[PDB]
Every structure is written in C-alpha cells, then in structure tokens.
Amino acid sequence: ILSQSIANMQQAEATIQSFSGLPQNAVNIQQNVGEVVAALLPQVQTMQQQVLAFAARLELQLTQQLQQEIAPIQTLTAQTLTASQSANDRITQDNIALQRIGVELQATIAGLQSNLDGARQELDSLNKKKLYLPGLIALAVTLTQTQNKVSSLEGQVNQIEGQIQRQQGFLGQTTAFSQQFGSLIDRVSKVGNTISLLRLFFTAALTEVRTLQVD
Amino acid sequence: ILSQSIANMQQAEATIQSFSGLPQNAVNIQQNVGEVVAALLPQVQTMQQQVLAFAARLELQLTQEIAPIQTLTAQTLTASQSANDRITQDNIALQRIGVELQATIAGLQSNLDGARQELDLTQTQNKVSSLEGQVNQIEGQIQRQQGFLGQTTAFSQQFGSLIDRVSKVGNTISLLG
Amino acid sequence: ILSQSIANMQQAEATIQSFSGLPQNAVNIQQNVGEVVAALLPQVQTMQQQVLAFAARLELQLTQQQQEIAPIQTLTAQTLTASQSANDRITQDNIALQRIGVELQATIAGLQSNLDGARQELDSLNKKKLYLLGGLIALAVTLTQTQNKVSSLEGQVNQIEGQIQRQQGFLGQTTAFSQQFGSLIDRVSKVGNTISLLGGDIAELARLFFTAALTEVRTLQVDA
Amino acid sequence: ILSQSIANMQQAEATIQSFSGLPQNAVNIQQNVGEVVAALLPQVQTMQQQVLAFAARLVQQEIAPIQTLTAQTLTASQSANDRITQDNIALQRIGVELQATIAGLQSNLDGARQELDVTLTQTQNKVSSLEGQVNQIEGQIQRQQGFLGQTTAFSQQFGSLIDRVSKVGNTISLLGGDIANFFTAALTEVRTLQVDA
C-alpha cells in the first residue's frame, strides 16, 4: 500500500508534467508534484526501511524474553507525516481553485454557444434559400457575411472547448494524485500511531511490532 | 427528433420533480421545467399538427395559410430559446454551489483526518463521530446536487435539439413565403 | 452516520423510482431500493433503539458495580446479512449497467458511420444534380428517399444519445445510493462487533474487565 | 478551427505519449495518434494553404490536384479516427471489467476487515493483501480513466477537423461543377471555401 501509493503517484507525475498553458494554480500543482516525487517519496521509502529494520530487531528481543532507538524513527515518521500533509493540503486548495475556474469557463461558453446558434440558424436559412434557388444575386453577400459570422463564433468557442478539455484532463490527474497521496498519509499516520503505542508486557508490544511489520 | 425531444423532455421532468430540499436555483428550474412540460410543449405539439396539415394541403395542389403558422412557429422558437437560456444560467449557478460544497467537505474532511488519526477517550470519539456525520451530510447534498444537475443538463440539451428542429421548420416556412 | 445515511437513502429513493423505460438491470435495483427503504431501514432503526436502550441500562449498572445480549446481537447479525445481500445485488446490477453503457457507445459509433455514409450519398446525388443543370425531375424522388434516410439515422443517433444520458444519470443515482448503503453496513458491523467484545469482556481482575465493558458500552452509544 | 483543431490535437498527444505500462489497446492509440500528428496534420496545413492561395484567384487544372489532396487527407483522417474510436470502446470494456474484479475482491475484504474489527496476524496478512490487491486495481482504473479522458478529447477534436475538411472537400466539388458548366455560383462557392479555412 505504501509502495503502490508511491508507484502510482510516480506514474501520474510525468502525465502531470505533460500539460502546458494551464492556469497558475495548475503550475503550482505541477511544481508541488515534482518536489514530492523527487524529494518526499524517497524520504518515505527511507522511513519504511528504517521501520522494517527497527521492527526486525525488536521482534526477536521480544520472542527471546518470553526505546533509545525509537526516538530518531519517531522524529522521521512525524516529519514525513507533516510534510506529506502540507504538500497534499497545497494540492487540495489548488484543485478547488481549478474547479471554480472550470465552472467560469462554462458560463463564458454559454454566451459563445448561444450567440453561435443565432448565426448557425441564420446561415441554415440562407443555405436553404441558396440550395432551392436574380434571387441568387440578392442572397450572395449576406450568405458570405453570415458564413463569416458563424466560423468566427465557432473559432472562439472551439478555443474555449480546448481550454475546458485540457483543464478537466489535468484535474482528473491531480485529483487521482491526491486520492493516492491520501492513501499514503493514512498509512504513514498509521505507522506513526504504532511507533507511539510502543509476559503480558512483551506480548502486547510484540503485536505492536507485528502490526508495524505488516503496515 | 421533435417527437423524440418532447418525450425525453417529459421523462427528465418527472426525475427533476422528485428531488426535495434543494437550493434556490434548483427550485427555479423545477418550476421552469413543469412550465415547459405543461404548456410550452403542447404549443410545440399543436404547431406540429398545423404545420403538417399546411404541409399536406400544398402537397395535393402541387400533385393565406403561411402567416398564421410562421407566427406560431417563430413565437414557439423564441419562447423555447428564452426558457432554455434561463435554465442554462441556473445550471451554472448550481455548479458554483456544487464547487462550494467541494470546498466545505474539504474543510470538514481535514478536521476529521485530524481527529480520526488521533482516534487511532469519549472526547475524541464524539468529536470524530460528529465530523463523520457532518461530512456524510455534505456528501449526501453533493450527490443529490450532481444528480439534479445531471437531469437539468440532460433536460436543457434535449430542449436545444427541439430548438434546432423548430428553428429548421421555421426556415422552410420562411422560404415558402 | 447510521441515521444520516438512512435519510440520504430515503431522499434518493423517490428519484430512483422516477425513471421509466430502463433495462431490466435498472428495474431490479428500483425494486431493491424499494424494499430497502420499506423493510430494512425501519429494522435498522429498531436495532438502533434496542441497542441504545440496552447500552443505557448496562452503562449505569457498570459505573455502579448476557440474557439481553442474545436477542439484540441476532437482530444485529440479521440486519448486517440482509443489508449486505441487498447491497451485493446493487453492485452486480450496476456493473451490468456499466457494460450496457459501453455497448451503447458501440451502437452510436455504428449509427454514426452509417449516418456519414448517407450524408455522402446525398452529396453524391447533388453532384449528379450539377450535371443535370446542363430528368432533374426524376432525381427529386430519389433526393427525398435519401433526404428521408439521413433524417432517419439522425433520429436513431438522437434516440441512443437520450438512452445513454438517461442510463448514466441512473448510474449516478444508484452508485450514490450504494455509496451511502456501504456507510450503513460499516456502522452496523461496527455495532455488532462491539456487542461481541462486550459479551467477551462481560463473560480484582473484575474491576478491570468491568471498566473495559464500560469502554465498549460508551462506544456502542457513540456509534448508534 | 483548422489550426485550433491541430493545436489541440498536438497538446493532447504529448500527454497521451506520457502514459506508460498501459494495456495494448492503450499502446495502439499511442502509436496511432503520434502518426496523426506527424503525418495527417502537416498535409492538413499544406491543403489549407493551397486551398487559400487557390481561392483568391485552366482552372480544372488548378482544382484537380487540390480536390484529390483534400479527398485523400479526409479518407486517411476517417480511418485513423475510426480505429481510435474502437480502441476507445475496447479500453472502456477493459475499464468496466476492472470495476468487476474489485466487485468480487472487495466483498471478501469487507469480510476480513470486519473480522479484524496467531489470531491478529492471520487476519492482518489477508487484509494486507486483499487491501493491496484492491488498491492496485484502483490505480489502473485511474490511469485508464485518465487515458480515455484524453484519447476521447483527441478523438472529438479530430472529429471537428474531419468534418470541416469534409465541408471544404464538398465545396471544391461544387465549385468544379459550377466552373465546368454559374460564374455567380462558382463565386459564392469560392467565398465559402475562403471562410472554411
């Protein structure tokens, strides 16, 4: 789960670097992601090996019998937690802000799709006249005038369709990335809890080492 | 298409009129949608009878009527255009309310993540339980509002088909005049 | 969450019943959602009362210091297995609809190809029309035959766009309904479990096991 | 629209080439889009320029090349697109079956995960695996939702380009009908051909 979390985030990374010409909150997420996968994720890989190592010793010392060591791996599980949470908290707010922009694009391509349908209707009409048809001369300039009018609004809209398309894609990525990171923070947190909750003395502790070892 | 439109617009009204408790903009649509389904659509069904008869009493005399029909076509087209433009604005108002709810589950979900990680002692237990309960409240409202938005969006789009089709009948009536 | 999921499950029902002319799979869900709201949710509410009441009685007895765990733990198990069953049937019917969903995608891609083939045909005929402006009367009959086929496929596309939209909409609902129901099962199970470990505990070392029993009585109450 | 269709198809394709370790239907699309960007789009640029130069101004000699080009550009573009649209449907089928395999896993995980809520470690391992297994199917399903997100967007932009190209290819035909035979019609058709590109 740690590892799959890590692996998945690693694979979304390149896909999130692939987008160009997105808003600043999207560039923020791009930068954040890059820092996490480069710096933060190997940190989590390091704590996990130190946790599996600290636990491998103490398991045997517990079985046999039937602290000083904890400290530096408590410290590390707590930074990793903190750091993870705050990077991820920075993604959550950037995601929310793209959501708001998402919507405002929608309302703008209202105007552009409502006005385009006036011109596409006007041109449909001219285009029936042309096809059924002195008459043809009286229609010719108006036709082209209206053709120009639709292509133009059709260009403007297709512009914003591209923006909307891109930002929806992007957001799919960073939401997914957030899903996974969260899974990573739950499990780090979980290992945080147990590095604290460390015959019936050693028996209890041994379950806490085993859970550590499975987590 | 015109028959297909009207009929699909009938089903989507019945679904839209099943939601209760929704915000300001969501009732605005609920009322608009029954207006269309109850009165405006009959006027589209009507004009079809009359357009198709007009279109039948020329077919004979190829093998005065123009104005009283193009007037009812062009009024139907315009009444529909404004009603659909109205629903459209309310939709983006609901999207905003939507995103705002995403912002609130966000704020709650953190305070929960905090107290819930601290769970894993009746003090913690109640604090989380309230925060759990609360975020299941904001999700319930989110799912329903997406549900509702899905149905008005599907209403609107189907309206626009009927708009295409009505406009097109008018354009032919126009050319024959 | 017990009570809040139930609300969300209740509000959503009416909406789920409102859909007409949907595939058999949707029709099963509809019927199931009907029975869940009618029969189970009231039985969940009864369980919740009986547990809250049991918990109040044993709470005082503990901060002062089996027969009436039997009835109230079978009820809990019964409520779980019934709920899980209903719910599993909603999972299996949704995936079926997800499959129907993609085949509909395949249909409309088919109706599209054919729709483009027609459009061309008309436009091939309207080439032969530019020639005949050199039996342009003959072509008017074969110009509506095709005008009428292009119209027909557009009508079919349109029919299958509505079907797609309408079904996706319903998946929207029954997925939300299911997400909620899972939250219920989670809570019922938690409740049942705590009512087992209670039994277990309740079955000087006394003052300890009693103060644990209290722990699980207290949580019982927070959880129901 | 032509340029805006191209530009969007380019941006879409960089993201599409970023996906890695995806099923075959995935890797097919990857290949098929990289082609479309490097092959079909240059020609679409070319033919836009050539129709525009031609549409400001014997002329049966001037249409002949520019008709077949358009008509060739169109037929390749429809083949590319139609093969994206099947890999599309096929990927969605892989997607749905992926939801199905969790629908079976997650059931027996719910079992063990309630059983958790000697003893503790038989429990814990199973839930570890079941949990990992399910969490893996999740990952694939997001990457695929992601991919399909993009090929679908690519495929819609493509559709919009193909349709214009089809519009400009039916005008050139119209125009050559008018010329060979009227000057007025031909004029209204070349003015339609200047608007489209």
Numbering used by the authors:
A (entry chain P): 5 to 70, 89 to 155, 164 to 228, 248 to 264
B (entry chain R): 5 to 67, 90 to 146, 173 to 229
C (entry chain S): 5 to 69, 89 to 157, 165 to 233, 245 to 265
D (entry chain Q): 5 to 61, 87 to 146, 171 to 234, 250 to 265
Can I see the authors' text?
We show that the orthologue identified in A. hydrophila (AhlABC) is a haemolytic tripartite α-PFT, requiring all three components for maximal lysis, and we present the structures of the soluble forms of monomeric AhlB and tetrameric AhlC and the decameric pore form of AhlB. AhlC provides the initial single leaflet insertion, assembly with AhlB then producing an oligomeric hydrophobic pore, and finally recruitment of AhlA produces a hydrophilic fully active AhlABC pore. Structural and sequence analysis suggests this method of pore assembly may well occur throughout the tripartite α-PFT family.
We have also determined the structure of a second crystal form of soluble AhlC in space group P21, which contains a complete tetramer in the asymmetric unit. In this second crystal form the head domains of subunit Q and S do not form crystal contacts and the electron density for these areas is poor, indicating that these hydrophobic head domains are flexible within the tetramer. Flexibility of the head to disassociate from the tetramer when presented with a hydrophobic surface is also shown in the crystals of AhlC, where the α3–α4 hydrophobic heads of two subunits protrude from the tetramer to pack against equivalent regions of symmetry related molecules in one crystal form and make no contacts and are disordered in the other. However, the AhC subunits of the soluble tetramer adopt a pore type conformation with the hydrophobic heads buried within the tail domains of symmetry related subunits. Thus some disassembly of the AhlC tetramer must occur before membrane attachment, supported by the cross-linking of AhlC, which abolishes lytic activity. To determine if disassembly of the tetramer is required for membrane binding, we cross-linked soluble AhlC with glutaraldehyde to produce equal proportions of AhlC monomer and AhlC dimer, whereas when AhlC was cross-linked with both glutaraldehyde and 1-ethyl-3-(3-dimethylaminopropyl)carbodiimide, the dimeric species was formed exclusively. Haemolytic assays using these cross-linked samples showed that lysis was abolished for the purely dimeric form and reduced by about 50% for the mixture of monomeric and dimeric AhlC.
